[PDB]
Amino acid sequence: IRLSRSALGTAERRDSEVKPAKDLADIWRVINEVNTINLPTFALYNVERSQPFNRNIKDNTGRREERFDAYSQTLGGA
Amino acid sequence: IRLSRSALGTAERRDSEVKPAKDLADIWRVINEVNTINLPTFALYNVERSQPFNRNIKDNTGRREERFDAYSQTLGGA
């Protein structure tokens, strides 16, 4: 998998070749929706954690008991 | 009790005499801090009470197990 990016204000553009990642994750999703399988857990825990905790923030969208909610904001920091 | 107000842009502004209502609503508070009594309730229920209800928590204002919270938005309709 290759993530490529050209600089801003440049006529030449570079594309990203993510096709084997697309193929493998498409395979995982297709086999899961046919007959339920265990999925890999990708997580990033950056310095973006150590935020203060407030119990009152409870309202959210996504139905937390949904299994595919486990991938909800799994990367990107805290 | 008399509530008075003149028009917009009027040079002379009429005052509102609320002194005996202030005294009668002050005697209740001053005796209530000493020895607990039964305070009266004042409520307004206009057409706005037909608002739809959604399962959300305000969790910002003051602590809904508190007697003077019963006067919170009591005459603002609904």
JSON list of C-alpha atoms in Angstrom, two decimals:
[
{"chain": "A", "resi": 1, "resn": "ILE", "atom": "CA", "xyz": [0.00, 0.00, 0.00]},
{"chain": "A", "resi": 2, "resn": "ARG", "atom": "CA", "xyz": [1.39, 3.40, -0.99]},
{"chain": "A", "resi": 3, "resn": "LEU", "atom": "CA", "xyz": [0.10, 6.76, 0.22]},
{"chain": "A", "resi": 4, "resn": "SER", "atom": "CA", "xyz": [1.39, 9.51, -2.06]},
{"chain": "A", "resi": 5, "resn": "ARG", "atom": "CA", "xyz": [0.83, 13.25, -2.05]},
{"chain": "A", "resi": 6, "resn": "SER", "atom": "CA", "xyz": [2.15, 16.05, -4.25]},
{"chain": "A", "resi": 7, "resn": "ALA", "atom": "CA", "xyz": [2.87, 19.55, -2.99]},
{"chain": "A", "resi": 8, "resn": "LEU", "atom": "CA", "xyz": [0.33, 22.36, -3.06]},
{"chain": "A", "resi": 9, "resn": "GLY", "atom": "CA", "xyz": [0.38, 24.57, -6.14]},
{"chain": "A", "resi": 10, "resn": "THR", "atom": "CA", "xyz": [1.97, 21.96, -8.42]},
{"chain": "A", "resi": 11, "resn": "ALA", "atom": "CA", "xyz": [0.54, 20.86, -11.77]},
{"chain": "A", "resi": 12, "resn": "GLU", "atom": "CA", "xyz": [1.88, 17.31, -11.43]},
{"chain": "A", "resi": 13, "resn": "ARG", "atom": "CA", "xyz": [-0.32, 15.07, -9.27]},
{"chain": "A", "resi": 14, "resn": "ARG", "atom": "CA", "xyz": [0.58, 11.74, -7.67]},
{"chain": "A", "resi": 15, "resn": "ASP", "atom": "CA", "xyz": [-2.00, 9.05, -6.93]},
{"chain": "A", "resi": 16, "resn": "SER", "atom": "CA", "xyz": [-2.04, 6.53, -4.09]},
{"chain": "A", "resi": 17, "resn": "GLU", "atom": "CA", "xyz": [-2.03, 2.81, -4.90]},
{"chain": "A", "resi": 18, "resn": "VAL", "atom": "CA", "xyz": [-4.13, 1.25, -2.13]},
{"chain": "A", "resi": 19, "resn": "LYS", "atom": "CA", "xyz": [-5.65, -1.57, -4.21]},
{"chain": "A", "resi": 20, "resn": "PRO", "atom": "CA", "xyz": [-4.34, -4.59, -2.16]},
{"chain": "A", "resi": 21, "resn": "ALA", "atom": "CA", "xyz": [-5.62, -2.88, 1.01]},
{"chain": "A", "resi": 22, "resn": "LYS", "atom": "CA", "xyz": [-8.98, -2.34, -0.73]},
{"chain": "A", "resi": 23, "resn": "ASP", "atom": "CA", "xyz": [-9.01, -6.00, -1.81]},
{"chain": "A", "resi": 24, "resn": "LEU", "atom": "CA", "xyz": [-8.15, -7.42, 1.63]},
{"chain": "A", "resi": 25, "resn": "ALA", "atom": "CA", "xyz": [-10.58, -5.24, 3.58]},
{"chain": "A", "resi": 26, "resn": "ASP", "atom": "CA", "xyz": [-13.28, -5.90, 0.97]},
{"chain": "A", "resi": 27, "resn": "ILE", "atom": "CA", "xyz": [-12.64, -9.62, 1.52]},
{"chain": "A", "resi": 28, "resn": "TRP", "atom": "CA", "xyz": [-12.98, -9.17, 5.30]},
{"chain": "A", "resi": 29, "resn": "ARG", "atom": "CA", "xyz": [-16.25, -7.24, 4.96]},
{"chain": "A", "resi": 30, "resn": "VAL", "atom": "CA", "xyz": [-17.75, -9.67, 2.41]},
{"chain": "A", "resi": 31, "resn": "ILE", "atom": "CA", "xyz": [-16.90, -12.80, 4.43]},
{"chain": "A", "resi": 32, "resn": "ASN", "atom": "CA", "xyz": [-18.21, -11.05, 7.57]},
{"chain": "A", "resi": 33, "resn": "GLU", "atom": "CA", "xyz": [-21.55, -10.14, 5.99]},
{"chain": "A", "resi": 34, "resn": "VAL", "atom": "CA", "xyz": [-22.00, -13.68, 4.65]},
{"chain": "A", "resi": 35, "resn": "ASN", "atom": "CA", "xyz": [-20.98, -15.61, 7.79]},
{"chain": "A", "resi": 36, "resn": "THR", "atom": "CA", "xyz": [-19.78, -13.68, 10.84]},
{"chain": "A", "resi": 37, "resn": "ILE", "atom": "CA", "xyz": [-16.02, -13.68, 11.42]},
{"chain": "A", "resi": 38, "resn": "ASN", "atom": "CA", "xyz": [-13.56, -12.06, 13.81]},
{"chain": "A", "resi": 39, "resn": "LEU", "atom": "CA", "xyz": [-12.16, -8.77, 12.58]},
{"chain": "A", "resi": 40, "resn": "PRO", "atom": "CA", "xyz": [-8.71, -7.23, 13.21]},
{"chain": "A", "resi": 41, "resn": "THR", "atom": "CA", "xyz": [-8.44, -4.38, 15.70]},
{"chain": "A", "resi": 42, "resn": "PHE", "atom": "CA", "xyz": [-6.63, -1.27, 14.45]},
{"chain": "A", "resi": 43, "resn": "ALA", "atom": "CA", "xyz": [-6.04, 1.36, 17.10]},
{"chain": "A", "resi": 44, "resn": "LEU", "atom": "CA", "xyz": [-3.89, 4.45, 17.57]},
{"chain": "A", "resi": 45, "resn": "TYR", "atom": "CA", "xyz": [-3.35, 5.93, 21.05]},
{"chain": "A", "resi": 46, "resn": "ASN", "atom": "CA", "xyz": [-1.47, 9.18, 20.48]},
{"chain": "A", "resi": 47, "resn": "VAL", "atom": "CA", "xyz": [-0.50, 11.93, 22.97]},
{"chain": "A", "resi": 48, "resn": "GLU", "atom": "CA", "xyz": [-4.04, 13.18, 22.02]},
{"chain": "A", "resi": 49, "resn": "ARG", "atom": "CA", "xyz": [-5.28, 11.30, 25.13]},
{"chain": "A", "resi": 50, "resn": "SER", "atom": "CA", "xyz": [-4.90, 12.63, 28.71]},
{"chain": "A", "resi": 51, "resn": "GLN", "atom": "CA", "xyz": [-7.88, 14.87, 28.08]},
{"chain": "A", "resi": 52, "resn": "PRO", "atom": "CA", "xyz": [-10.04, 15.61, 31.15]},
{"chain": "A", "resi": 53, "resn": "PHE", "atom": "CA", "xyz": [-13.05, 13.36, 31.71]},
{"chain": "A", "resi": 54, "resn": "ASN", "atom": "CA", "xyz": [-16.60, 14.70, 31.90]},
{"chain": "A", "resi": 55, "resn": "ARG", "atom": "CA", "xyz": [-19.38, 12.21, 32.63]},
{"chain": "A", "resi": 56, "resn": "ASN", "atom": "CA", "xyz": [-22.10, 14.52, 31.28]},
{"chain": "A", "resi": 57, "resn": "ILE", "atom": "CA", "xyz": [-21.04, 14.12, 27.63]},
{"chain": "A", "resi": 58, "resn": "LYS", "atom": "CA", "xyz": [-23.22, 11.12, 26.78]},
{"chain": "A", "resi": 59, "resn": "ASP", "atom": "CA", "xyz": [-25.23, 12.21, 23.74]},
{"chain": "A", "resi": 60, "resn": "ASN", "atom": "CA", "xyz": [-23.73, 10.78, 20.55]},
{"chain": "A", "resi": 61, "resn": "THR", "atom": "CA", "xyz": [-24.79, 9.19, 17.26]},
{"chain": "A", "resi": 62, "resn": "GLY", "atom": "CA", "xyz": [-23.76, 5.70, 16.24]},
{"chain": "A", "resi": 63, "resn": "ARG", "atom": "CA", "xyz": [-25.56, 3.18, 18.51]},
{"chain": "A", "resi": 64, "resn": "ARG", "atom": "CA", "xyz": [-22.60, 2.16, 20.72]},
{"chain": "A", "resi": 65, "resn": "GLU", "atom": "CA", "xyz": [-23.59, -1.51, 21.01]},
{"chain": "A", "resi": 66, "resn": "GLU", "atom": "CA", "xyz": [-23.22, -1.96, 17.23]},
{"chain": "A", "resi": 67, "resn": "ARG", "atom": "CA", "xyz": [-20.17, -4.13, 16.51]},
{"chain": "A", "resi": 68, "resn": "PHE", "atom": "CA", "xyz": [-19.01, -1.88, 13.66]},
{"chain": "A", "resi": 69, "resn": "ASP", "atom": "CA", "xyz": [-19.14, 0.99, 16.17]},
{"chain": "A", "resi": 70, "resn": "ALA", "atom": "CA", "xyz": [-15.88, -0.56, 17.45]},
{"chain": "A", "resi": 71, "resn": "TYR", "atom": "CA", "xyz": [-14.17, 1.08, 14.44]},
{"chain": "A", "resi": 72, "resn": "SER", "atom": "CA", "xyz": [-15.72, 4.46, 15.33]},
{"chain": "A", "resi": 73, "resn": "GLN", "atom": "CA", "xyz": [-12.78, 6.90, 15.69]},
{"chain": "A", "resi": 74, "resn": "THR", "atom": "CA", "xyz": [-10.41, 4.01, 16.41]},
{"chain": "A", "resi": 75, "resn": "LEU", "atom": "CA", "xyz": [-7.49, 6.00, 14.93]},
{"chain": "A", "resi": 76, "resn": "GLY", "atom": "CA", "xyz": [-6.80, 9.71, 15.02]},
{"chain": "A", "resi": 77, "resn": "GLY", "atom": "CA", "xyz": [-5.54, 9.98, 18.57]},
{"chain": "A", "resi": 78, "resn": "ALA", "atom": "CA", "xyz": [-7.44, 9.59, 21.82]},
{"chain": "B", "resi": 1, "resn": "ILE", "atom": "CA", "xyz": [-48.26, 45.35, 42.49]},
{"chain": "B", "resi": 2, "resn": "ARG", "atom": "CA", "xyz": [-48.19, 47.51, 39.36]},
{"chain": "B", "resi": 3, "resn": "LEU", "atom": "CA", "xyz": [-45.88, 46.99, 36.38]},
{"chain": "B", "resi": 4, "resn": "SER", "atom": "CA", "xyz": [-45.40, 50.03, 34.14]},
{"chain": "B", "resi": 5, "resn": "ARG", "atom": "CA", "xyz": [-43.47, 50.72, 30.95]},
{"chain": "B", "resi": 6, "resn": "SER", "atom": "CA", "xyz": [-43.67, 53.59, 28.45]},
{"chain": "B", "resi": 7, "resn": "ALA", "atom": "CA", "xyz": [-43.21, 53.50, 24.68]},
{"chain": "B", "resi": 8, "resn": "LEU", "atom": "CA", "xyz": [-39.91, 53.04, 22.86]},
{"chain": "B", "resi": 9, "resn": "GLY", "atom": "CA", "xyz": [-37.99, 56.29, 22.47]},
{"chain": "B", "resi": 10, "resn": "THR", "atom": "CA", "xyz": [-40.01, 58.06, 25.18]},
{"chain": "B", "resi": 11, "resn": "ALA", "atom": "CA", "xyz": [-38.09, 60.68, 27.16]},
{"chain": "B", "resi": 12, "resn": "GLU", "atom": "CA", "xyz": [-39.88, 59.93, 30.45]},
{"chain": "B", "resi": 13, "resn": "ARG", "atom": "CA", "xyz": [-39.80, 56.35, 31.75]},
{"chain": "B", "resi": 14, "resn": "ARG", "atom": "CA", "xyz": [-42.48, 55.26, 34.20]},
{"chain": "B", "resi": 15, "resn": "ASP", "atom": "CA", "xyz": [-41.31, 53.22, 37.18]},
{"chain": "B", "resi": 16, "resn": "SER", "atom": "CA", "xyz": [-42.90, 49.99, 38.39]},
{"chain": "B", "resi": 17, "resn": "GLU", "atom": "CA", "xyz": [-44.04, 49.81, 42.03]},
{"chain": "B", "resi": 18, "resn": "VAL", "atom": "CA", "xyz": [-43.40, 46.24, 43.22]},
{"chain": "B", "resi": 19, "resn": "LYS", "atom": "CA", "xyz": [-42.62, 47.01, 46.88]},
{"chain": "B", "resi": 20, "resn": "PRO", "atom": "CA", "xyz": [-45.40, 45.03, 48.70]},
{"chain": "B", "resi": 21, "resn": "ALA", "atom": "CA", "xyz": [-44.95, 42.02, 46.40]},
{"chain": "B", "resi": 22, "resn": "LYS", "atom": "CA", "xyz": [-41.21, 42.25, 47.10]},
{"chain": "B", "resi": 23, "resn": "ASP", "atom": "CA", "xyz": [-41.92, 42.31, 50.84]},
{"chain": "B", "resi": 24, "resn": "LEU", "atom": "CA", "xyz": [-44.33, 39.35, 50.62]},
{"chain": "B", "resi": 25, "resn": "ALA", "atom": "CA", "xyz": [-41.93, 37.31, 48.50]},
{"chain": "B", "resi": 26, "resn": "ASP", "atom": "CA", "xyz": [-39.03, 38.29, 50.79]},
{"chain": "B", "resi": 27, "resn": "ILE", "atom": "CA", "xyz": [-40.77, 37.20, 54.02]},
{"chain": "B", "resi": 28, "resn": "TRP", "atom": "CA", "xyz": [-41.17, 33.70, 52.53]},
{"chain": "B", "resi": 29, "resn": "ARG", "atom": "CA", "xyz": [-37.46, 33.37, 51.70]},
{"chain": "B", "resi": 30, "resn": "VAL", "atom": "CA", "xyz": [-36.22, 34.84, 55.01]},
{"chain": "B", "resi": 31, "resn": "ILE", "atom": "CA", "xyz": [-38.41, 32.56, 57.11]},
{"chain": "B", "resi": 32, "resn": "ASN", "atom": "CA", "xyz": [-37.63, 29.60, 54.80]},
{"chain": "B", "resi": 33, "resn": "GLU", "atom": "CA", "xyz": [-33.86, 29.79, 55.39]},
{"chain": "B", "resi": 34, "resn": "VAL", "atom": "CA", "xyz": [-34.55, 29.59, 59.13]},
{"chain": "B", "resi": 35, "resn": "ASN", "atom": "CA", "xyz": [-37.36, 27.03, 59.37]},
{"chain": "B", "resi": 36, "resn": "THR", "atom": "CA", "xyz": [-38.73, 25.05, 56.44]},
{"chain": "B", "resi": 37, "resn": "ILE", "atom": "CA", "xyz": [-42.22, 26.00, 55.18]},
{"chain": "B", "resi": 38, "resn": "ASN", "atom": "CA", "xyz": [-44.49, 25.30, 52.19]},
{"chain": "B", "resi": 39, "resn": "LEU", "atom": "CA", "xyz": [-43.76, 27.80, 49.43]},
{"chain": "B", "resi": 40, "resn": "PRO", "atom": "CA", "xyz": [-46.46, 28.46, 46.80]},
{"chain": "B", "resi": 41, "resn": "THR", "atom": "CA", "xyz": [-46.01, 27.49, 43.17]},
{"chain": "B", "resi": 42, "resn": "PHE", "atom": "CA", "xyz": [-46.46, 29.68, 40.10]},
{"chain": "B", "resi": 43, "resn": "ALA", "atom": "CA", "xyz": [-46.66, 28.12, 36.65]},
{"chain": "B", "resi": 44, "resn": "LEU", "atom": "CA", "xyz": [-47.53, 29.13, 33.09]},
{"chain": "B", "resi": 45, "resn": "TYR", "atom": "CA", "xyz": [-48.67, 26.56, 30.51]},
{"chain": "B", "resi": 46, "resn": "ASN", "atom": "CA", "xyz": [-49.28, 28.12, 27.10]},
{"chain": "B", "resi": 47, "resn": "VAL", "atom": "CA", "xyz": [-49.40, 26.62, 23.57]},
{"chain": "B", "resi": 48, "resn": "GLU", "atom": "CA", "xyz": [-45.59, 26.12, 23.63]},
{"chain": "B", "resi": 49, "resn": "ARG", "atom": "CA", "xyz": [-46.12, 23.03, 25.86]},
{"chain": "B", "resi": 50, "resn": "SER", "atom": "CA", "xyz": [-47.02, 21.20, 22.62]},
{"chain": "B", "resi": 51, "resn": "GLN", "atom": "CA", "xyz": [-43.30, 21.03, 21.75]},
{"chain": "B", "resi": 52, "resn": "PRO", "atom": "CA", "xyz": [-42.05, 17.52, 20.89]},
{"chain": "B", "resi": 53, "resn": "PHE", "atom": "CA", "xyz": [-40.05, 15.67, 23.52]},
{"chain": "B", "resi": 54, "resn": "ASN", "atom": "CA", "xyz": [-36.65, 14.07, 22.83]},
{"chain": "B", "resi": 55, "resn": "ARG", "atom": "CA", "xyz": [-34.64, 11.93, 25.27]},
{"chain": "B", "resi": 56, "resn": "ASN", "atom": "CA", "xyz": [-31.84, 14.40, 25.92]},
{"chain": "B", "resi": 57, "resn": "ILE", "atom": "CA", "xyz": [-30.28, 15.73, 29.13]},
{"chain": "B", "resi": 58, "resn": "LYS", "atom": "CA", "xyz": [-29.44, 19.40, 29.61]},
{"chain": "B", "resi": 59, "resn": "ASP", "atom": "CA", "xyz": [-26.82, 18.57, 32.33]},
{"chain": "B", "resi": 60, "resn": "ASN", "atom": "CA", "xyz": [-25.69, 22.23, 32.44]},
{"chain": "B", "resi": 61, "resn": "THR", "atom": "CA", "xyz": [-28.00, 24.06, 34.86]},
{"chain": "B", "resi": 62, "resn": "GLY", "atom": "CA", "xyz": [-28.43, 23.49, 38.56]},
{"chain": "B", "resi": 63, "resn": "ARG", "atom": "CA", "xyz": [-28.77, 19.99, 39.92]},
{"chain": "B", "resi": 64, "resn": "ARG", "atom": "CA", "xyz": [-32.34, 18.62, 39.71]},
{"chain": "B", "resi": 65, "resn": "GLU", "atom": "CA", "xyz": [-32.70, 17.64, 43.38]},
{"chain": "B", "resi": 66, "resn": "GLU", "atom": "CA", "xyz": [-33.04, 21.12, 44.88]},
{"chain": "B", "resi": 67, "resn": "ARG", "atom": "CA", "xyz": [-36.21, 22.88, 46.03]},
{"chain": "B", "resi": 68, "resn": "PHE", "atom": "CA", "xyz": [-35.64, 26.21, 44.27]},
{"chain": "B", "resi": 69, "resn": "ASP", "atom": "CA", "xyz": [-35.00, 24.27, 41.07]},
{"chain": "B", "resi": 70, "resn": "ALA", "atom": "CA", "xyz": [-38.79, 23.80, 41.09]},
{"chain": "B", "resi": 71, "resn": "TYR", "atom": "CA", "xyz": [-39.01, 27.49, 40.14]},
{"chain": "B", "resi": 72, "resn": "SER", "atom": "CA", "xyz": [-36.60, 26.94, 37.21]},
{"chain": "B", "resi": 73, "resn": "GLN", "atom": "CA", "xyz": [-38.37, 28.22, 34.05]},
{"chain": "B", "resi": 74, "resn": "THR", "atom": "CA", "xyz": [-41.70, 27.88, 35.84]},
{"chain": "B", "resi": 75, "resn": "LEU", "atom": "CA", "xyz": [-43.38, 30.91, 34.20]},
{"chain": "B", "resi": 76, "resn": "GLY", "atom": "CA", "xyz": [-41.61, 30.83, 30.85]},
{"chain": "B", "resi": 77, "resn": "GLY", "atom": "CA", "xyz": [-44.39, 28.74, 29.39]},
{"chain": "B", "resi": 78, "resn": "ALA", "atom": "CA", "xyz": [-44.45, 25.02, 28.54]}
]
